[PDB]
Amino acid sequence: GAMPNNIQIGGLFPNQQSQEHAAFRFALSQLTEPPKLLPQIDIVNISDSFEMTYRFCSQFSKGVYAIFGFYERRTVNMLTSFCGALHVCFITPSFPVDTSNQFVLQLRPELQEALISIIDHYKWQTFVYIYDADRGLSVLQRVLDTAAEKNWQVTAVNILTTTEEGYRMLFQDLEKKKERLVVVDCESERLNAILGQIVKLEKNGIGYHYILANLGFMDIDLNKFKESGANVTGFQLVNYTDTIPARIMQQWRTSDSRDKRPKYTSALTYDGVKVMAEAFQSLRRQRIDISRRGNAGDCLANPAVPWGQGIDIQRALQQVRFEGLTGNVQFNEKGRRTNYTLHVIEMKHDGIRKIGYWNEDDKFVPAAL
Amino acid sequence: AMPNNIQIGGLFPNQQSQEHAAFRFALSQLTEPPKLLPQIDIVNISDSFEMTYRFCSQFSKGVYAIFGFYERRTVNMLTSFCGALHVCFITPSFPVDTSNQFVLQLRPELQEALISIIDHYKWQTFVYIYDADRGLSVLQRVLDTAAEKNWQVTAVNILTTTEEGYRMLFQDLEKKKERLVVVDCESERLNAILGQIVKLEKNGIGYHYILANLGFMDIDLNKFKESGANVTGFQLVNYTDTIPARIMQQWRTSDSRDHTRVDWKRPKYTSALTYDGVKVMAEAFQSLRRQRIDISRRGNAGDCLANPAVPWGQGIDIQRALQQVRFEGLTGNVQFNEKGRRTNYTLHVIEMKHDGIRKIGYWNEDDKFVPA
Ligand SMILES: *[C@@H]1O[C@H](CO)[C@@H](O[C@@H]2O[C@H](CO)[C@@H](O[C@@H]3O[C@H](CO[C@H]4O[C@H](CO)[C@@H](O)[C@H](O[C@H]5O[C@H](CO)[C@@H](O)[C@H](O)[C@@H]5O[C@H]5O[C@H](CO)[C@@H](O)[C@H](O)[C@@H]5O)[C@@H]4O)[C@@H](O)[C@H](O[C@H]4O[C@H](CO)[C@@H](O)[C@H](O)[C@@H]4O)[C@@H]3O)[C@H](O)[C@H]2NC(C)=O)[C@H](O)[C@H]1NC(C)=O
Ligand SMILES: *[C@@H]1O[C@H](CO)[C@@H](O[C@@H]2O[C@H](CO)[C@@H](O[C@@H]3O[C@H](CO)[C@@H](O)[C@H](O)[C@@H]3O)[C@H](O)[C@H]2NC(C)=O)[C@H](O)[C@H]1NC(C)=O
Ligand SMILES: *[C@@H]1O[C@H](CO)[C@@H](O[C@@H]2O[C@H](CO)[C@@H](O)[C@H](O)[C@H]2NC(C)=O)[C@H](O)[C@H]1NC(C)=O
Ligand SMILES: *[C@@H]1O[C@H](CO)[C@@H](O[C@@H]2O[C@H](CO)[C@@H](O)[C@H](O)[C@H]2NC(C)=O)[C@H](O)[C@H]1NC(C)=O
Ligand SMILES: *[C@@H]1O[C@H](CO)[C@@H](O[C@@H]2O[C@H](CO)[C@@H](O)[C@H](O)[C@H]2NC(C)=O)[C@H](O)[C@H]1NC(C)=O
Ligand SMILES: *[C@@H]1O[C@H](CO)[C@@H](O[C@@H]2O[C@H](CO)[C@@H](O)[C@H](O)[C@H]2NC(C)=O)[C@H](O)[C@H]1NC(C)=O
Ligand SMILES: *[C@@H]1O[C@H](CO)[C@@H](O)[C@H](O)[C@H]1NC(C)=O
């Protein structure tokens, strides 16, 4: 049969004032085709499993059809388990983890392979790897595995445990090598501070090279770092001057002016809304009969009784394919971004320039220049 | 005052195990009121949803504490539910460093000791073999010390490594003839992993294996002792020390004429921790009762989830009583810091050479490691 004209969508957000939140509202306002996505977002501590659970169960008993929100490390397991038990989908731009089930739709592309490619490309054989551990440890594992495989000499520093002396200690046996190579793997909000810290710790007469293992390159203090002559390479998800993103920034620009550069997490929040819209428009027109109980269907039971039409909504969300702010948006059957392109940017000589791009199939292709 | 019966919830992975039998045995030994009344539910301890259903269900029916096991996927959920509602979870599961006062880890930390031992042996470069399934706490710790002491660690997840992949890092090593390996794996796989690992050594070279985990004593000592393998590990229970010996005695002599029993040869360390775990609860509750600090709670559904979470009022009293417990158990001196970790305990280091199984020395928080 049919679906209602409104589709209630749950939200798990860390706060109601943020640029991701603005991206969310503005993208919802761009939708014209039915059914209408009716957001019902809650402000929640995304690090606390208890609070997230209360919200998720609260959202579920209420009959929302999917949940868009963010998840932290401590809560990733709880969210994956609850989605899998209830067949309720979670759409998120948060750092992708390993071993989600198929009901978690990850807007954010995995970086680990791209990172490996860029390291091989530069022919790095030994390097320092810096990690904070609050956004997953998969990348480090992937780095250590390839290192063992390729006989690379990797030194690992989790910044949180290292006050100032640790960084200085790495060069105790580092003369006769005129170029030190460093991978920085940390949360985006924190990238600028760590970069600033480790550049201060630099020694004279050694050449320093940095590769950013996380998106977040362009959302940093670029002028300070380029003007300092820093060598830095990172990934960029959004071409802000390509045809479709330029158009989008256009309307967004006009929208703000009556009532500046979006971060990659904002851009994914905006595509995440289109993912939901595409899925629910697609069920509506496909004539797939969906109903959901306003009833307080209790979230907790043994065994968990899955929403029976949930698998239908999971399939629609997974098969979506379109051109968004972050280029081609598409998922494999496990709910990860697939068939995406990453722009590789190299900041060098007081200049930042695109040096190529990376995708799963072609890996990395150098630009003409 | 105090109820004559104190309902304790349990979260157990299995119907039948040595740990469950140790749990039961230890309960039967208690004679002082109040009665500890177990209400355990068999549950998938990897699934956060099942665990949440059981935690909430037990909290609603009025348990005073929960004794149970958790896995890498559920440690965050339990810590969070314990912290928000102020019910204590007492557990021998692999301990963590982001817990809270409401989670009593009967199991002692090993990560600092492991490093110490790696020092007394003076290893500067080595392979670290680890188990992704169970956590990366120890690996991170070692990697950081590698950093600050120029150790050159090659880390290898057993669950991505092939037979050839493993020998690869080696067939290409040739300066010192010794290849030093740290094995950090789930205690159940330890026997196998050591088995798969031993054949995979190119024949003509020497070795040294250090185990990052407890489980050493429960392995096939015979193949390695016979082999002349060099294995070093930890021991937490001395079965020949006075209090443990007597505890074994009582346990063997009851299961002697009991006509339907099994589960007694030499106890796994998890069973020992489970036995001490119960004594922790007993000591805390008998102590609460003899102090006239009252308690009680209503059976009530819908109770569990709220925003904000409404913690149990007397929860903190029970947590404090459980945390200040102290005594000689199967696993030595049982005592907790305010973070809920085992404290003031000693680890014994054991060495396998020729036909020698020997204590090399011991470890603690202030002396680090002292040779014997
Ligand atoms: C770190 O971890 C360690 C363990 O590794 C902890 O050390 C333990 O701490 C506990 C708790 O404090 C200790 O138990 C208490 O011990 C005191 C001290 O005296 C004891 O030990 C010696 C032997 O080593 C004996 O002298 C004592 O035994 C005599 O008295 C008892 C009655 O108290 C009686 O049963 C015996 O017959 C015995 O008499 C003989 O000796 C006396 C004196 O020399 C002599 O006059 C007589 O003629 C006989 O020869 C005694 O056991 C003890 O007083 C405490 O008893 C009091 O409190 C307890 C409550 O627990 C009650 O049971 C009791 O009625 C008393 O009120 C405790 O037994 C434990 O010994 C100790 N273990 C070790 C190995 O040293 C550390 O505390 C931890 N460190 C930190 C910082 O936390
Ligand atoms: C959201 O919920 C999380 C998880 O439940 C809360 O985390 C807890 O918060 C406090 C303060 O941030 C942490 O304490 C700090 O721990 C360090 C490290 O041991 C300690 O040295 C500091 O003194 C400090 O007390 C606590 O460990 C942490 N619990 C965790 C991470 O499991 C958090 O409070 C909530 N966040 C917000 C913004 O309300
Ligand atoms: C950025 O990269 C350049 C080029 O690799 C680094 O320049 C090298 O620096 C060392 C030590 O000062 C010289 O001896 C090399 O011969 C330089 N090579 C070239 C080609 O210029 C430079 O130091 C790096 N920038 C920073 C800030 O570390
Ligand atoms: C990966 O994404 C690309 C880029 O969007 C897809 O290319 C499109 O292919 C469809 C159907 O074959 C055409 O209608 C479009 O004209 C193509 N668009 C662009 C921009 O090239 C490609 O099909 C996808 N590949 C896979 C394997 O799914
Ligand atoms: C207990 O729950 C866990 C996690 O919720 C289940 O784990 C899944 O197991 C399948 C089958 O091996 C794996 O392919 C998935 O990767 C696992 N999911 C996750 C999130 O890890 C597990 O199967 C359950 N165990 C039992 C005995 O039922
Ligand atoms: C256990 O350790 C000993 C010494 O720590 C290893 O002995 C080495 O053996 C190789 C040949 O296998 C010799 O070339 C070395 O010179 C020996 N080293 C020393 C310091 O004596 C022994 O091989 C190890 N056991 C096993 C089973 O590998
Ligand atoms: C932006 O798109 C333009 C097309 O005008 C192209 O030249 C460039 O490769 C893109 N920018 C990045 C950073 O990839």
UniProtKB/Swiss-Prot annotation, chain A:
Tissue pattern of expression reads: Detected in cerebellum (at protein level).
Q: Which residues are glycosylated?
A: N45, N231, N239, N339
Coiled-coil residue spans: none
Topological domains (Extracellular): residue ranges? 4-368
Changes after translation = Palmitoylated. Depalmitoylated by CPT1C and upon L-glutamate stimulation.
Annotated S-S bridges: C57-C299
Quote the subcellular location field of this record. Answer: Cell membrane; Endoplasmic reticulum membrane; Postsynaptic cell membrane; Postsynaptic density membrane
Query: Superkingdom, according to UniProt?
Result: Eukaryota
Miscellaneous note of the record: The postsynaptic actions of L-glutamate are mediated by a variety of receptors that are named according to their selective agonists. This receptor binds AMPA (quisqualate) > L-glutamate > kainate.
**Subunit details for this protein?**
Homotetramer or heterotetramer of pore-forming glutamate receptor subunits; heteromeric assembly can be the result of both receptor subtype and flip-flop forms and according the composition, one partner can be dominant with respect to the fast desensitizing current component, whereas the other can determine the steady-state component. Tetramers may be formed by the dimerization of dimers. Found in a complex with GRIA2, GRIA3, GRIA4, CNIH2, CNIH3, CACNG2, CACNG3, CACNG4, CACNG5, CACNG7 and CACNG8. Interacts with HIP1 and RASGRF2. Interacts with SYNDIG1 and GRIA2.
The record's domain comment reads:
The M4 transmembrane segment mediates tetramerization and is required for cell surface expression.
> What does the protein in this record do?
Ionotropic glutamate receptor that functions as a ligand-gated cation channel, gated by L-glutamate and glutamatergic agonists such as alpha-amino-3-hydroxy-5-methyl-4-isoxazolepropionic acid (AMPA), quisqualic acid, and kainic acid. L-glutamate acts as an excitatory neurotransmitter at many synapses in the central nervous system.
Q: What protein family does this chain belong to? A: Belongs to the glutamate-gated ion channel (TC 1.A.10.1) family. GRIA1 subfamily.
Protein name, as recorded:
Glutamate receptor 1
Give the species this sequence originates from: Rattus norvegicus
